Amino acid sequence: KWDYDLRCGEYTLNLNEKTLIMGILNVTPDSFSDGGSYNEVDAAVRHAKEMRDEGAHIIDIGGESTRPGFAKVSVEEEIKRVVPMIQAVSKEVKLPISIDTYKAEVAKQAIEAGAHIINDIWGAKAEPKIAEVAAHYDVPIILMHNRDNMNYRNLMADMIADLYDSIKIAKDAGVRDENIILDPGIGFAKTPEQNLEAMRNLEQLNVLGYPVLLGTSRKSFIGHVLDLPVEERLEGTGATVCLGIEKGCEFVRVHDVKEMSRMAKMMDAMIGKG
Amino acid sequence: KWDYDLRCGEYTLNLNEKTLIMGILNVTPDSFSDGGSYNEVDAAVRHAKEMRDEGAHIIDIGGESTRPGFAKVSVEEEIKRVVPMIQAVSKEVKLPISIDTYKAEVAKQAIEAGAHIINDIWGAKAEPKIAEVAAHYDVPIILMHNRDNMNYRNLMADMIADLYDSIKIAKDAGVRDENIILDPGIGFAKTPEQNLEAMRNLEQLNVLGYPVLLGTSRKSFIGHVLDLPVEERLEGTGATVCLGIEKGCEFVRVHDVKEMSRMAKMMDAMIGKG
Ligand SMILES: Nc1nc(NCCCOc2ccc(C(=O)O)cc2)c(N=O)c(=O)[nH]1
Numbered sequence: 001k002w003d004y005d006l007r008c009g010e011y012t013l014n015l016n017e018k019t020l021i022m023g024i025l026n027v028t029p030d031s032f033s034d035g036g037s038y039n040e041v042d043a044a045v046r047h048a049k050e051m052r053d054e055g056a057h058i059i060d061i062g063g064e065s066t067r068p069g070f071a072k073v074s075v076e077e078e079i080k081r082v083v084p085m086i087q088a089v090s091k092e093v094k095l096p097i098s099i100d101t102y103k104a105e106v107a108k109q110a111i112e113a114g115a116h117i118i119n120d121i122w123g124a125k126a127e128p129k130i131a132e133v134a135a136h137y138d139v140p141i142i143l144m145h146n147r148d149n150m151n152y153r154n155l156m157a158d159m160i161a162d163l164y165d166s167i168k169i170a171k172d173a174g175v176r177d178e179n180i181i182l183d184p185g186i187g188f189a190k191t192p193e194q195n196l197e198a199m200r201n202l203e204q205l206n207v208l209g210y211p212v213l214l215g216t217s218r219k220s221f222i223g224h225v226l227d228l229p230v231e232e233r234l235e236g237t238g239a240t241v242c243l244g245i246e247k248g249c250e251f252v253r254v255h256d257v258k259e260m261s262r263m264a265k266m267m268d269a270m271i272g273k274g
Numbered sequence: 275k276w277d278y279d280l281r282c283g284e285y286t287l288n289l290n291e292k293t294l295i296m297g298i299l300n301v302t303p304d305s306f307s308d309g310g311s312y313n314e315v316d317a318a319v320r321h322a323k324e325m326r327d328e329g330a331h332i333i334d335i336g337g338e339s340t341r342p343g344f345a346k347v348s349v350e351e352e353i354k355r356v357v358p359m360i361q362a363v364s365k366e367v368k369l370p371i372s373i374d375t376y377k378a379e380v381a382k383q384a385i386e387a388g389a390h391i392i393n394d395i396w397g398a399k400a401e402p403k404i405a406e407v408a409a410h411y412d413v414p415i416i417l418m419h420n421r422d423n424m425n426y427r428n429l430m431a432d433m434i435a436d437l438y439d440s441i442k443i444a445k446d447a448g449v450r451d452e453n454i455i456l457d458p459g460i461g462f463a464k465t466p467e468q469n470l471e472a473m474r475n476l477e478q479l480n481v482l483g484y485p486v487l488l489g490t491s492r493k494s495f496i497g498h499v500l501d502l503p504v505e506e507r508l509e510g511t512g513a514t515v516c517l518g519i520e521k522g523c524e525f526v527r528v529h530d531v532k533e534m535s536r537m538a539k540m541m542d543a544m545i546g547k548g
């Protein structure tokens with residue numbers, strides 16, 4: 001399949017050999033500072049080493065603006081939190097880092113402080129200027145599907161159209177094709193039922209010709225199906241990661257790294273990946 | 275898909291609604307008797323109730339002749355062990371029971387003592403007379419793929435041919451089509467690599483037009499891929515059960531019932547089963 005590797009500055013990721021595990025960094029902010037305090041940076045570094053030891057290939061690190069139950073946060077604010085965490089994890093853990101942000105100033109600073117991949121939940125549509133940051137630093141950029149409504153004419157046809165609008169924004173900024181990753185955005189502007197329909201038809205995403213990241217870890221559509229709370233979603237999650245790899249994804253973005261790494265590796269063996 | 279239900283005397287199994295979990299009964303024999311002692315029958319009954327409570331739809335119970343690290347055992351011997359266990363589990367747990375045996379006298383006695391399904395690892399080839407027991411009691415019969423060599427010309431073509439030889443034995447004894455289940459026999463007369471090749475191509479088994487049971491729970495091909503001991507094979511197992519359901523299986527035969535039931539149910543939701 002892939003005739004190139006994902007170039008991540010110091011690191012190379014081969015897309016043919018294995019499904020790549022991206023581990024979700026658990027960020028617990030210190031009640032008493034706006035960023036860079038010992039307890040919260042040390043929590044982040046130890047969690048990254050755990051994930052590295054359990055099999056992660058990329059560490060994903062987010063600021064308050066994109067991470068669930070928080071209010072919106074300033075750009076100045078998001079940078080103080082996240083940049084000390086990038087610096088520490090980057091020096092201390094030998095894996096590429098993706099910065100999860102949709103804001104172009106936050107992406108730029110995160111890269112300067114040692115990030116390799118940009119993870120955008122708005123697919124360059126919130127701030128088109130982020131695709132300019134990508135092209136300049138020449139870093140991979142994940143363009144996730146998202147929209148500000150759930151009025152689909154045909155769920156998958158529309159998702160593909162919305163992903164191409166993202167791809168067009170990126171390429172018009174000089175983003176090289178080999179620095180584009182797509183994401184179907186499970187959980188984002190989709191009913192519980194639309195989420196399962198996108199799972200059921202993920203293979204259609206491969207016609208665009210770019211690697212696909214999948215992120216279903218613990219999402220509430222799992223809780224919809226199984227009737228289970230967030231901490232009881234492991235098995236449900238593992239089902240979506242296996243279906244996702246049978247359907248052609250190159251990455252998955254998971255909390256339960258040790259578990260999902262074993263499922264990934266068994267699946268790779270069976271489909272004949274690598 | 276299925277225009278009929280699996281009729282199991284007292285119980286009916288709908289093949290369209292859900293993947294059916296068959297739970298593997300843990301049989302720990304009493305050092306001091308040849309069968310029917312309290313400790314070992316009570317262990318069996320409590321394990322069945324655990325599996326019922328965790329989501330199992332069928333309980334699978336085997337005698338010494340088919341269960342791994344034991345020597346061959348007599349017919350008289352296999353009946354004393356297994357028949358007290360059938361009687362107790364059957365009265366006490368409200369689910370169909372399958373008797374795992376390839377011997378026609380053992381199958382007959384197990385049914386008389388309350389079993390609903392026959393599970394034959396030799397596919398009626400060890401003792402063709404078992405298909406006569408099936409037809410008479412009019413019970414479902416699982417015909418697993420197995421052979422006495424690993425000289426395949428084309429693994430899957432040969433498996434399908436060997437399964438049809440089984441089906442021909444069964445039908446020539448008066449086994450109704452609706453009482454036939456096939457099994458690709460993962461682990462049986464196949465290298466670690468042949469096992470993955472059968473996983474990769476299980477969907478071909480559906481051309482025969484019968485429900486398919488899959489049993490990969492903890493098998494050593496998982497240990498081959500992941501380099502993990504028997505008790506560390508949960509994630510590997512879950513991968514094979516999901517690929518198996520994406521490929522059209524109606525049953526899986528599992529040790530880890532609670533876990534594999536959640537994965538089964540998420541998968542059902544995504545493929546649109548039920
Ligand atoms: N690209 C991509 N990013 C994602 N997330 C980035 C935005 C922030 O999302 C978070 C979701 C969960 C967590 C957490 O549980 O700690 C932290 C952050 C996806 N899912 O949340 C996804 O499916 N794909």
Ligand SMILES: Nc1nc(NCCCOc2ccc(C(=O)O)cc2)c(N=O)c(=O)[nH]1
Nearest residue numbers: 336340341342374393395416418457460489
């Ligand atoms: N039909 C069918 N029967 C099977 N087994 C019946 C024969 C006895 O096999 C056992 C395998 C494991 C265990 C156990 O771990 O307790 C007990 C019995 C399959 N796998 O072992 C299979 O994949 N399909």
